[PDB]
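tissue-type plasminogen activator
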Amino acid sequence: SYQVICRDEKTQMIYQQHQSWLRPVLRSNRVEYCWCNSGRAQCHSVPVKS
């Protein structure tokens, strides 16, 4: 009921506030890092050279 979740349509999974959840890469080998900063899903791309 309250606003504290984050709906990600790129995976179809909900997340809580300040919650972190990774996502597939773009086309190379990077990783999509994203976490709820308030309810808009804050994302940032930081590679990992796997």
